[PDB]
Amino acid sequence: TGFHPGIAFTVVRQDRFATEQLLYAERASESYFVGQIQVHHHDAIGGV
Amino acid sequence: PFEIEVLLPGELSPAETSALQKCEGKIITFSTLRHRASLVDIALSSYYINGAPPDTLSLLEAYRMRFAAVITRVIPGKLLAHAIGVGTPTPGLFIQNTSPVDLCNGDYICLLPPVFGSADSIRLDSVGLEIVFPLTIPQTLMREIIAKVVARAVERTAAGAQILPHEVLRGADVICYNGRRYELETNLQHRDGSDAAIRTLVLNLMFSINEGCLLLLALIPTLLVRFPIYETISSWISTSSRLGDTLGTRAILRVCVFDGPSTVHPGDRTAVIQV
Amino acid sequence: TTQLIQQVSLTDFFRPDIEHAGSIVLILRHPSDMIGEANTLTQAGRDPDVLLEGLRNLFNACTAPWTVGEGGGLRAYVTSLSFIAACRAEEYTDKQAADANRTAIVSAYGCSRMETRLIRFSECLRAMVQCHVFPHRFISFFGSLLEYTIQDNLCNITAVAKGPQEAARTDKTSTRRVTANIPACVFWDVDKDLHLSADGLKHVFLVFVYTQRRQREGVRLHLALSQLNEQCFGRGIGFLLGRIRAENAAWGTEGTRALPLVQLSNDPTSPRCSIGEITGVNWNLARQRLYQWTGDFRGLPTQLSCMYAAYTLIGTIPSESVRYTRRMERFGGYNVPTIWLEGVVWGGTNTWNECYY
């Protein structure tokens, strides 16, 4: 009927805005090692 | 060391070719063992003898005793077919999903063509031959389904014979599984298979049960608080053995999808394999 | 000839890091039809309120209510059998080793907030067994799990139908050949009748005990290893569990004479009433002089409440002179009982039969 506030109250609001990102790395950041690659034969759902 | 390839109708109607292309992904029943199976369907319902020809049992026996086959694309001039029944195994086969019921991998599945309501089929006016696609379901669920169908048919017959109503609302009768709803006996009309072909079987089962329970109740219980009278018992035993033998256990199908989707719907990518 | 099945798993209910390779797992199923059929399964003998409360508290204890409850789409498929095997091993007259094995298991894998969940699961299964809901129709069999990987709440669980123990040769560790070790401390001793020379294609029977005692009803895992068919094994389980079968029958009878109609039906000149029944003029006036027999159905409303056999023909082995070997190892400070079962194949279909002879 009237909604008389006899006590204080608070609300919670959450926001999620997308943001961009910038990437920059120096020479001594990370290294890469090449492994061993081999040819294997498997079975598919309609063939090889 | 050769194989058997189906015939390819060259220079056919565009509508017929479109229908064949549309139904190419659907499962196609295998032909006969020796040469060909073309007039078997026509001759199956030839002995009508002035009445409804009993064909449910014959078609069930034919489907149980016959294997299946997988068709390939149609190329004008040359046709290719694959068979893994008695020929050579193939590295994987692609068959579109047909049964709307949900299926789970890693479990043994059976095959049983439904006879209640309606089933998917393909029929051509210029051909005159129809193919019924059996529904594949697990044996554990199939037993419950057939038991529920038998109970519903028995209760419907009792209600129709007693004249006065006898159906008691025991609660909800909706089966839910993985978000799929399945309602049975939602109507009491156009029942073309409820008491047409299985009526004789259910009547035989009922009278056998009645005679057996009467025979046991005659003298068996003791702790409760010129006619040899043996031909009927022998006939009951013979009929029970016959129905047990004809019940069958067709557990040869299996489902195994490599990294397949969780939910299954008609029109997906499944696999066909045996054990 | 190689088939693989991929399944998803969670981290709050299963930790693949503790489990090693070569383990055996069983795929479960969501009780979507069971929660609806429990009303008929409980029947008028018991009440469904206890089952409703049990499932309610099981759902409350289970995490992610928005996914589980009506479908096993986003739930953990693979479940560790070690916990249930240890829980059901209490009624085996052998607990000295079980307690020592479980003291470290509870301390490491458990702790935190798990005792309440364990008690809830135990009481839920006790209520399910007591109400005779038959929850054994969702147990299957799979091959060894020699590969496992997980990056973030997603385990790529893979398995095979057969067992390539003699041909895998992954060579991913210091070992040269793969192996599959699974504890079998719940193996029932059935050699009292086959202690003589018996060799050949032995069959493994997965028998589930279904007791009908007073507040001590439960299902315990059991194993067997003997070359037998479905008839001899059934007869053995029939006339070998006679005492417990009789006890269950006596407990389940929670509550009528002969009749001379057979003689008068057998002798000639029997009273036949067919034309009167067809006409219908004496539909009810002719049956009033018949034999009522004062029959009552309160003596035994149901008879399938004494089931105690749930054996399944799963698992085969063609090796001769089978003899399990148990050794000792360490996984960082806690020994684990492992049995060397390698270079064997398995297969077959499941046969769930409920025998109450």
CSV table of N, CA, C and O in Angstrom, one decimal, chain C residues 235-346:
chain,number,residue,atom,x,y,z
C,235,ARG,N,21.9,-73.0,-9.9
C,235,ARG,CA,21.5,-74.1,-9.0
C,235,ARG,C,22.3,-74.0,-7.7
C,235,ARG,O,21.8,-74.2,-6.6
C,236,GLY,N,23.6,-73.7,-7.8
C,236,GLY,CA,24.5,-73.5,-6.7
C,236,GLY,C,24.0,-72.3,-5.8
C,236,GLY,O,23.9,-72.4,-4.6
C,237,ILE,N,23.7,-71.2,-6.4
C,237,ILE,CA,23.3,-70.0,-5.7
C,237,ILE,C,21.9,-70.2,-5.1
C,237,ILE,O,21.4,-69.6,-4.2
C,238,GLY,N,21.1,-71.2,-5.7
C,238,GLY,CA,19.8,-71.5,-5.2
C,238,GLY,C,19.9,-72.4,-3.9
C,238,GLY,O,19.2,-72.0,-2.9
C,239,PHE,N,20.6,-73.5,-4.0
C,239,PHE,CA,20.6,-74.4,-2.9
C,239,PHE,C,21.9,-74.3,-2.0
C,239,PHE,O,22.2,-75.2,-1.3
C,240,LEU,N,22.6,-73.1,-2.1
C,240,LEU,CA,23.7,-72.8,-1.2
C,240,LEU,C,23.3,-71.6,-0.3
C,240,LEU,O,24.0,-71.5,0.8
C,241,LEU,N,22.4,-70.8,-0.6
C,241,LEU,CA,22.0,-69.7,0.2
C,241,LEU,C,20.6,-70.0,0.9
C,241,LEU,O,19.8,-69.1,1.0
C,242,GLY,N,20.4,-71.2,1.2
C,242,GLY,CA,19.1,-71.6,1.7
C,242,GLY,C,18.7,-71.0,3.0
C,242,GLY,O,17.6,-70.5,3.2
C,243,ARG,N,19.7,-70.8,4.0
C,243,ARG,CA,19.4,-70.3,5.3
C,243,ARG,C,19.0,-68.8,5.2
C,243,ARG,O,18.0,-68.4,5.7
C,244,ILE,N,19.8,-68.0,4.4
C,244,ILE,CA,19.4,-66.6,4.3
C,244,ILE,C,18.2,-66.4,3.5
C,244,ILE,O,17.4,-65.5,3.7
C,245,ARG,N,18.0,-67.3,2.5
C,245,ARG,CA,16.7,-67.2,1.7
C,245,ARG,C,15.5,-67.5,2.6
C,245,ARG,O,14.5,-66.7,2.5
C,246,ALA,N,15.6,-68.5,3.4
C,246,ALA,CA,14.5,-68.8,4.3
C,246,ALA,C,14.3,-67.6,5.3
C,246,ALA,O,13.1,-67.3,5.7
C,247,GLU,N,15.3,-67.1,5.8
C,247,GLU,CA,15.2,-65.9,6.7
C,247,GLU,C,14.6,-64.7,6.1
C,247,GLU,O,13.7,-64.1,6.7
C,248,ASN,N,14.9,-64.4,4.8
C,248,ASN,CA,14.3,-63.3,4.1
C,248,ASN,C,12.8,-63.6,3.8
C,248,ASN,O,12.0,-62.7,3.9
C,249,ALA,N,12.5,-64.9,3.5
C,249,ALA,CA,11.1,-65.2,3.2
C,249,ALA,C,10.3,-65.1,4.5
C,249,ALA,O,9.2,-64.6,4.5
C,250,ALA,N,10.8,-65.5,5.6
C,250,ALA,CA,10.1,-65.4,6.9
C,250,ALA,C,10.0,-63.9,7.3
C,250,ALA,O,8.9,-63.5,7.8
C,251,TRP,N,11.0,-63.1,7.0
C,251,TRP,CA,10.9,-61.7,7.4
C,251,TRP,C,9.9,-60.9,6.5
C,251,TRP,O,9.2,-60.0,6.9
C,252,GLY,N,9.8,-61.3,5.2
C,252,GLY,CA,9.0,-60.6,4.3
C,252,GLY,C,7.5,-61.0,4.3
C,252,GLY,O,6.7,-60.3,3.6
C,253,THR,N,7.1,-62.0,5.1
C,253,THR,CA,5.7,-62.4,5.2
C,253,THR,C,5.0,-61.6,6.3
C,253,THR,O,4.7,-62.1,7.4
C,254,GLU,N,4.9,-60.3,6.0
C,254,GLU,CA,4.2,-59.4,7.0
C,254,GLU,C,2.7,-59.4,6.7
C,254,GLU,O,2.2,-58.5,6.1
C,255,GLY,N,2.1,-60.5,7.1
C,255,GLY,CA,0.6,-60.6,6.9
C,255,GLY,C,-0.2,-59.7,7.9
C,255,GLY,O,-0.5,-58.6,7.5
C,256,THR,N,-7.7,-70.4,1.3
C,256,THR,CA,-6.5,-70.6,2.1
C,256,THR,C,-6.3,-72.1,2.3
C,256,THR,O,-5.3,-72.6,2.9
C,257,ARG,N,-7.3,-72.9,1.9
C,257,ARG,CA,-7.3,-74.4,2.1
C,257,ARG,C,-7.5,-75.1,0.8
C,257,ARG,O,-7.6,-74.4,-0.3
C,258,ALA,N,-7.7,-76.4,0.8
C,258,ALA,CA,-7.9,-77.2,-0.4
C,258,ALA,C,-9.4,-77.1,-0.8
C,258,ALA,O,-10.2,-76.4,-0.1
C,259,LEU,N,-9.7,-77.7,-1.9
C,259,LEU,CA,-11.1,-77.6,-2.4
C,259,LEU,C,-11.4,-78.9,-3.2
C,259,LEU,O,-10.5,-79.4,-3.9
C,260,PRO,N,-12.6,-79.4,-3.1
C,260,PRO,CA,-12.9,-80.7,-3.8
C,260,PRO,C,-13.5,-80.4,-5.2
C,260,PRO,O,-14.1,-81.4,-5.7
C,261,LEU,N,-13.4,-79.2,-5.7
C,261,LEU,CA,-14.0,-79.0,-7.1
C,261,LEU,C,-13.3,-79.8,-8.2
C,261,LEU,O,-13.9,-80.1,-9.2
C,262,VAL,N,-12.0,-80.1,-7.9
C,262,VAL,CA,-11.3,-80.9,-8.9
C,262,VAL,C,-11.9,-82.3,-9.2
C,262,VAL,O,-12.0,-82.7,-10.3
C,263,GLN,N,-12.4,-82.9,-8.1
C,263,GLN,CA,-13.0,-84.2,-8.3
C,263,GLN,C,-14.3,-84.2,-9.1
C,263,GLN,O,-14.5,-85.0,-10.0
C,264,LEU,N,-15.1,-83.2,-8.8
C,264,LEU,CA,-16.4,-83.1,-9.5
C,264,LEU,C,-16.2,-82.5,-10.9
C,264,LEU,O,-17.1,-82.7,-11.7
C,265,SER,N,-15.1,-81.8,-11.2
C,265,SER,CA,-14.8,-81.5,-12.5
C,265,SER,C,-14.2,-82.7,-13.3
C,265,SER,O,-14.5,-82.8,-14.5
C,266,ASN,N,-13.5,-83.6,-12.6
C,266,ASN,CA,-12.9,-84.7,-13.3
C,266,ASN,C,-14.0,-85.8,-13.6
C,266,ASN,O,-14.0,-86.3,-14.7
C,267,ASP,N,-14.9,-86.1,-12.7
C,267,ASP,CA,-15.9,-87.1,-12.9
C,267,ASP,C,-16.9,-86.6,-14.0
C,267,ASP,O,-17.1,-85.4,-14.1
C,268,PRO,N,-17.6,-87.5,-14.7
C,268,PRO,CA,-18.6,-87.1,-15.7
C,268,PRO,C,-19.8,-86.5,-15.0
C,268,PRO,O,-19.9,-86.4,-13.8
C,269,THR,N,-20.8,-86.2,-15.9
C,269,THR,CA,-22.1,-85.6,-15.5
C,269,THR,C,-21.9,-84.4,-14.6
C,269,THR,O,-22.6,-84.1,-13.6
C,270,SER,N,-20.9,-83.6,-15.0
C,270,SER,CA,-20.6,-82.4,-14.3
C,270,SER,C,-21.7,-81.3,-14.6
C,270,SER,O,-22.3,-81.3,-15.7
C,271,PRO,N,-22.0,-80.5,-13.6
C,271,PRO,CA,-23.0,-79.4,-13.8
C,271,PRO,C,-22.5,-78.3,-14.8
C,271,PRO,O,-21.6,-77.5,-14.4
C,272,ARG,N,-23.0,-78.3,-16.0
C,272,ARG,CA,-22.6,-77.3,-17.0
C,272,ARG,C,-23.7,-76.3,-17.2
C,272,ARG,O,-24.9,-76.6,-17.4
C,273,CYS,N,-23.3,-75.0,-17.2
C,273,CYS,CA,-24.2,-73.9,-17.4
C,273,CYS,C,-23.7,-73.0,-18.5
C,273,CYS,O,-22.9,-72.1,-18.2
C,274,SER,N,-24.0,-73.3,-19.7
C,274,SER,CA,-23.6,-72.6,-20.9
C,274,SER,C,-24.7,-71.8,-21.6
C,274,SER,O,-24.6,-70.7,-21.9
C,275,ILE,N,-25.8,-72.5,-21.9
C,275,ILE,CA,-27.0,-71.9,-22.5
C,275,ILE,C,-27.6,-70.8,-21.6
C,275,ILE,O,-27.9,-69.7,-22.1
C,276,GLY,N,-27.6,-71.1,-20.3
C,276,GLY,CA,-28.1,-70.0,-19.4
C,276,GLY,C,-27.2,-68.8,-19.3
C,276,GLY,O,-27.7,-67.7,-19.3
C,277,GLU,N,-25.9,-69.0,-19.4
C,277,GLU,CA,-25.0,-67.9,-19.4
C,277,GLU,C,-25.1,-67.1,-20.7
C,277,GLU,O,-25.0,-65.9,-20.7
C,278,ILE,N,-25.3,-67.8,-21.8
C,278,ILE,CA,-25.4,-67.2,-23.1
C,278,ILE,C,-26.7,-66.3,-23.2
C,278,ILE,O,-26.7,-65.2,-23.6
C,279,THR,N,-27.8,-66.9,-22.7
C,279,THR,CA,-29.0,-66.1,-22.7
C,279,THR,C,-29.0,-64.9,-21.7
C,279,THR,O,-29.5,-63.9,-22.0
C,280,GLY,N,-28.3,-65.1,-20.6
C,280,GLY,CA,-28.2,-64.1,-19.6
C,280,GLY,C,-29.4,-63.9,-18.6
C,280,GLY,O,-29.3,-63.0,-17.8
C,281,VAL,N,-30.4,-64.8,-18.7
C,281,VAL,CA,-31.5,-64.7,-17.8
C,281,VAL,C,-31.1,-65.1,-16.4
C,281,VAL,O,-31.8,-64.8,-15.4
C,282,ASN,N,-30.0,-65.8,-16.2
C,282,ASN,CA,-29.4,-66.3,-14.9
C,282,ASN,C,-28.0,-65.9,-14.8
C,282,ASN,O,-27.1,-66.7,-14.4
C,283,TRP,N,-27.7,-64.6,-15.2
C,283,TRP,CA,-26.3,-64.2,-15.1
C,283,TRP,C,-25.8,-64.1,-13.7
C,283,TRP,O,-24.7,-64.5,-13.4
C,284,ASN,N,-26.6,-63.6,-12.7
C,284,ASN,CA,-26.3,-63.6,-11.3
C,284,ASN,C,-27.1,-64.5,-10.4
C,284,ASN,O,-26.7,-64.7,-9.3
C,285,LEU,N,-28.2,-65.0,-10.9
C,285,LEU,CA,-29.0,-65.9,-10.1
C,285,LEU,C,-28.5,-67.3,-10.1
C,285,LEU,O,-29.0,-68.1,-9.2
C,286,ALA,N,-27.6,-67.7,-10.9
C,286,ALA,CA,-27.0,-69.0,-11.0
C,286,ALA,C,-25.7,-69.1,-10.2
C,286,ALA,O,-25.3,-70.3,-9.8
C,287,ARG,N,-24.9,-68.1,-10.1
C,287,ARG,CA,-23.7,-68.1,-9.4
C,287,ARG,C,-23.8,-67.9,-7.9
C,287,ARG,O,-22.7,-68.0,-7.2
C,288,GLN,N,-25.0,-67.6,-7.4
C,288,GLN,CA,-25.1,-67.4,-5.9
C,288,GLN,C,-25.0,-68.7,-5.2
C,288,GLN,O,-24.7,-68.7,-4.0
C,289,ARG,N,-25.2,-69.9,-5.8
C,289,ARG,CA,-25.1,-71.2,-5.2
C,289,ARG,C,-23.7,-71.9,-5.4
C,289,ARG,O,-23.5,-73.0,-5.1
C,290,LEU,N,-22.7,-71.1,-6.0
C,290,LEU,CA,-21.4,-71.7,-6.2
C,290,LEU,C,-20.6,-71.7,-4.9
C,290,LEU,O,-21.1,-71.3,-3.8
C,291,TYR,N,-19.3,-72.1,-5.0
C,291,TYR,CA,-18.4,-72.2,-3.9
C,291,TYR,C,-17.6,-70.9,-3.8
C,291,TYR,O,-16.8,-70.6,-4.7
C,292,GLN,N,-17.9,-70.1,-2.8
C,292,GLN,CA,-17.2,-68.8,-2.6
C,292,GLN,C,-15.7,-69.1,-2.2
C,292,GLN,O,-14.8,-68.3,-2.6
C,293,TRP,N,-15.4,-70.1,-1.4
C,293,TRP,CA,-14.1,-70.6,-1.0
C,293,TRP,C,-13.5,-69.6,0.0
C,293,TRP,O,-12.4,-69.9,0.5
C,294,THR,N,-14.1,-68.5,0.3
C,294,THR,CA,-13.7,-67.5,1.3
C,294,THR,C,-12.2,-67.1,1.0
C,294,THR,O,-11.4,-67.0,2.0
C,295,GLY,N,-11.9,-66.9,-0.2
C,295,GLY,CA,-10.5,-66.6,-0.5
C,295,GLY,C,-10.1,-65.2,-0.1
C,295,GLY,O,-10.9,-64.3,-0.1
C,296,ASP,N,-8.9,-65.1,0.4
C,296,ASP,CA,-8.3,-63.8,0.8
C,296,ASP,C,-6.9,-63.6,0.2
C,296,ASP,O,-6.1,-64.6,0.2
C,297,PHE,N,-6.6,-62.4,-0.2
C,297,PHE,CA,-5.3,-62.1,-0.8
C,297,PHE,C,-4.4,-61.4,0.2
C,297,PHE,O,-3.3,-60.9,-0.2
C,298,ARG,N,-4.8,-61.3,1.5
C,298,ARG,CA,-3.9,-60.7,2.5
C,298,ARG,C,-2.8,-61.6,3.0
C,298,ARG,O,-1.9,-61.1,3.6
C,299,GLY,N,-2.8,-62.9,2.6
C,299,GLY,CA,-1.8,-63.8,3.1
C,299,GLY,C,-0.4,-63.5,2.5
C,299,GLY,O,0.6,-63.5,3.2
C,300,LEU,N,-0.4,-63.2,1.2
C,300,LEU,CA,0.8,-62.8,0.5
C,300,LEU,C,0.5,-62.0,-0.7
C,300,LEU,O,0.3,-62.5,-1.8
C,301,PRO,N,0.5,-60.6,-0.5
C,301,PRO,CA,0.3,-59.8,-1.7
C,301,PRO,C,1.3,-59.8,-2.8
C,301,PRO,O,1.0,-59.8,-3.9
C,302,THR,N,2.6,-59.9,-2.4
C,302,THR,CA,3.7,-59.9,-3.3
C,302,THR,C,4.6,-61.1,-3.0
C,302,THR,O,4.7,-61.5,-1.8
C,303,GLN,N,5.3,-61.6,-4.0
C,303,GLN,CA,6.3,-62.7,-3.8
C,303,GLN,C,7.7,-62.4,-4.3
C,303,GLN,O,8.6,-63.2,-4.0
C,304,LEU,N,7.9,-61.3,-5.0
C,304,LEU,CA,9.2,-60.9,-5.5
C,304,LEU,C,10.0,-60.1,-4.5
C,304,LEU,O,11.0,-59.5,-4.9
C,305,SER,N,9.6,-60.1,-3.2
C,305,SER,CA,10.3,-59.3,-2.2
C,305,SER,C,11.5,-60.1,-1.6
C,305,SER,O,12.1,-59.6,-0.6
C,306,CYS,N,11.7,-61.4,-2.0
C,306,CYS,CA,12.7,-62.2,-1.4
C,306,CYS,C,13.9,-62.5,-2.4
C,306,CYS,O,14.6,-63.5,-2.3
C,307,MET,N,14.1,-61.6,-3.4
C,307,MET,CA,15.2,-61.7,-4.3
C,307,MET,C,16.5,-61.5,-3.6
C,307,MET,O,16.7,-60.6,-2.9
C,308,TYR,N,17.5,-62.4,-3.9
C,308,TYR,CA,18.8,-62.4,-3.3
C,308,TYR,C,19.9,-62.7,-4.3
C,308,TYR,O,21.1,-62.7,-3.8
C,309,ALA,N,19.6,-62.9,-5.5
C,309,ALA,CA,20.6,-63.2,-6.5
C,309,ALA,C,20.6,-62.2,-7.7
C,309,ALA,O,19.5,-62.1,-8.3
C,310,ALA,N,21.7,-61.6,-8.0
C,310,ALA,CA,21.8,-60.6,-9.1
C,310,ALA,C,23.1,-60.8,-9.8
C,310,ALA,O,23.8,-59.8,-10.1
C,311,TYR,N,23.5,-62.0,-10.1
C,311,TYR,CA,24.7,-62.3,-10.7
C,311,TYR,C,24.7,-61.9,-12.2
C,311,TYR,O,23.6,-62.0,-12.9
C,312,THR,N,25.8,-61.4,-12.7
C,312,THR,CA,26.0,-61.0,-14.1
C,312,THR,C,27.2,-61.7,-14.7
C,312,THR,O,28.3,-61.6,-14.1
C,313,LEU,N,27.0,-62.3,-15.9
C,313,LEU,CA,28.1,-62.9,-16.5
C,313,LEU,C,29.0,-61.9,-17.3
C,313,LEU,O,28.8,-61.7,-18.5
C,314,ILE,N,29.9,-61.3,-16.6
C,314,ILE,CA,30.8,-60.3,-17.1
C,314,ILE,C,32.2,-60.7,-16.7
C,314,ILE,O,32.5,-60.8,-15.5
C,315,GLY,N,33.1,-60.8,-17.7
C,315,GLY,CA,34.5,-61.1,-17.4
C,315,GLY,C,34.9,-62.6,-17.7
C,315,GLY,O,34.3,-63.5,-17.2
C,316,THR,N,35.9,-62.7,-18.6
C,316,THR,CA,36.3,-64.1,-19.0
C,316,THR,C,37.8,-64.1,-19.0
C,316,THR,O,38.5,-63.1,-19.2
C,317,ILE,N,38.4,-65.3,-18.8
C,317,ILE,CA,39.9,-65.5,-18.8
C,317,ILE,C,40.2,-66.9,-19.3
C,317,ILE,O,39.7,-67.9,-18.7
C,318,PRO,N,41.0,-67.0,-20.3
C,318,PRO,CA,41.4,-68.3,-20.8
C,318,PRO,C,42.7,-68.9,-20.2
C,318,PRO,O,43.1,-70.0,-20.6
C,319,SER,N,43.4,-68.1,-19.4
C,319,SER,CA,44.7,-68.6,-18.8
C,319,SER,C,44.5,-69.7,-17.9
C,319,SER,O,43.5,-69.7,-17.1
C,320,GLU,N,45.4,-70.7,-17.9
C,320,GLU,CA,45.3,-71.9,-17.0
C,320,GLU,C,46.0,-71.6,-15.7
C,320,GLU,O,46.9,-70.7,-15.6
C,321,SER,N,45.7,-72.4,-14.7
C,321,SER,CA,46.3,-72.3,-13.4
C,321,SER,C,46.3,-70.8,-12.9
C,321,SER,O,47.3,-70.2,-12.6
C,322,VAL,N,45.1,-70.3,-12.8
C,322,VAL,CA,44.9,-68.9,-12.3
C,322,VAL,C,45.3,-68.8,-10.8
C,322,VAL,O,44.8,-69.6,-10.0
C,323,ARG,N,46.1,-67.8,-10.5
C,323,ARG,CA,46.5,-67.6,-9.1
C,323,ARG,C,46.9,-66.1,-8.9
C,323,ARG,O,47.8,-65.6,-9.5
C,324,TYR,N,46.1,-65.4,-8.1
C,324,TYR,CA,46.3,-64.0,-7.9
C,324,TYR,C,47.6,-63.8,-7.1
C,324,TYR,O,47.9,-64.6,-6.2
C,325,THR,N,48.3,-62.7,-7.4
C,325,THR,CA,49.6,-62.4,-6.6
C,325,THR,C,49.5,-61.0,-6.1
C,325,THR,O,49.1,-60.1,-6.9
C,326,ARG,N,49.8,-60.8,-4.8
C,326,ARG,CA,49.7,-59.5,-4.2
C,326,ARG,C,51.1,-59.1,-3.7
C,326,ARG,O,51.8,-59.9,-3.0
C,327,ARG,N,51.5,-57.9,-4.0
C,327,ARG,CA,52.8,-57.4,-3.6
C,327,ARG,C,52.6,-56.1,-2.8
C,327,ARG,O,51.5,-55.7,-2.5
C,328,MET,N,53.7,-55.4,-2.5
C,328,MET,CA,53.7,-54.2,-1.7
C,328,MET,C,54.5,-53.1,-2.5
C,328,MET,O,55.5,-53.3,-3.1
C,329,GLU,N,53.9,-51.9,-2.5
C,329,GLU,CA,54.5,-50.8,-3.2
C,329,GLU,C,54.2,-49.5,-2.4
C,329,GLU,O,53.7,-49.6,-1.2
C,330,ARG,N,54.6,-48.4,-2.9
C,330,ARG,CA,54.4,-47.1,-2.2
C,330,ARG,C,54.1,-46.0,-3.2
C,330,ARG,O,54.6,-46.0,-4.3
C,331,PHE,N,53.2,-45.1,-2.8
C,331,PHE,CA,52.7,-44.0,-3.6
C,331,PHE,C,53.1,-42.7,-2.9
C,331,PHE,O,52.4,-41.7,-3.1
C,332,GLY,N,54.2,-42.6,-2.2
C,332,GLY,CA,54.7,-41.4,-1.5
C,332,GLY,C,54.6,-41.5,0.0
C,332,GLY,O,54.8,-40.5,0.7
C,333,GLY,N,54.3,-42.7,0.6
C,333,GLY,CA,54.2,-42.8,2.0
C,333,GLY,C,53.0,-43.7,2.5
C,333,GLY,O,52.8,-43.9,3.6
C,334,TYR,N,52.2,-44.1,1.5
C,334,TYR,CA,51.0,-45.0,1.8
C,334,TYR,C,51.0,-46.1,0.8
C,334,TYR,O,51.0,-45.9,-0.4
C,335,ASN,N,51.1,-47.3,1.4
C,335,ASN,CA,51.1,-48.5,0.5
C,335,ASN,C,49.7,-48.8,0.0
C,335,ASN,O,48.7,-48.4,0.6
C,336,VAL,N,49.7,-49.4,-1.2
C,336,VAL,CA,48.4,-49.7,-1.9
C,336,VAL,C,48.4,-51.2,-2.3
C,336,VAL,O,49.4,-51.7,-2.8
C,337,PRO,N,47.3,-51.9,-2.0
C,337,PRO,CA,47.2,-53.3,-2.4
C,337,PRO,C,46.9,-53.4,-3.9
C,337,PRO,O,45.8,-53.0,-4.4
C,338,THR,N,47.8,-53.9,-4.7
C,338,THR,CA,47.7,-54.0,-6.1
C,338,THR,C,47.9,-55.5,-6.5
C,338,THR,O,48.7,-56.2,-5.9
C,339,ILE,N,47.1,-55.9,-7.5
C,339,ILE,CA,47.2,-57.3,-8.0
C,339,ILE,C,47.6,-57.2,-9.5
C,339,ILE,O,47.0,-56.5,-10.3
C,340,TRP,N,48.6,-58.0,-9.8
C,340,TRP,CA,49.2,-58.0,-11.2
C,340,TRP,C,48.3,-58.8,-12.1
C,340,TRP,O,48.4,-60.0,-12.1
C,341,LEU,N,47.5,-58.1,-12.9
C,341,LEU,CA,46.6,-58.8,-13.9
C,341,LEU,C,46.9,-58.1,-15.2
C,341,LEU,O,46.2,-57.1,-15.6
C,342,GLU,N,47.8,-58.7,-16.0
C,342,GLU,CA,48.2,-58.2,-17.3
C,342,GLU,C,48.2,-59.3,-18.3
C,342,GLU,O,48.3,-60.5,-17.9
C,343,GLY,N,48.2,-58.9,-19.6
C,343,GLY,CA,48.2,-59.9,-20.6
C,343,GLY,C,46.9,-60.7,-20.7
C,343,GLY,O,47.1,-61.9,-21.0
C,344,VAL,N,45.8,-60.2,-20.4
C,344,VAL,CA,44.5,-60.9,-20.5
C,344,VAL,C,43.5,-60.1,-21.3
C,344,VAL,O,43.6,-58.9,-21.4
C,345,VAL,N,42.5,-60.8,-21.8
C,345,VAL,CA,41.4,-60.2,-22.5
C,345,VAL,C,40.1,-60.5,-21.8
C,345,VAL,O,39.9,-61.4,-21.1
C,346,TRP,N,39.1,-59.6,-22.1
C,346,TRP,CA,37.8,-59.7,-21.5
C,346,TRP,C,36.7,-59.3,-22.5
C,346,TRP,O,37.0,-58.6,-23.4
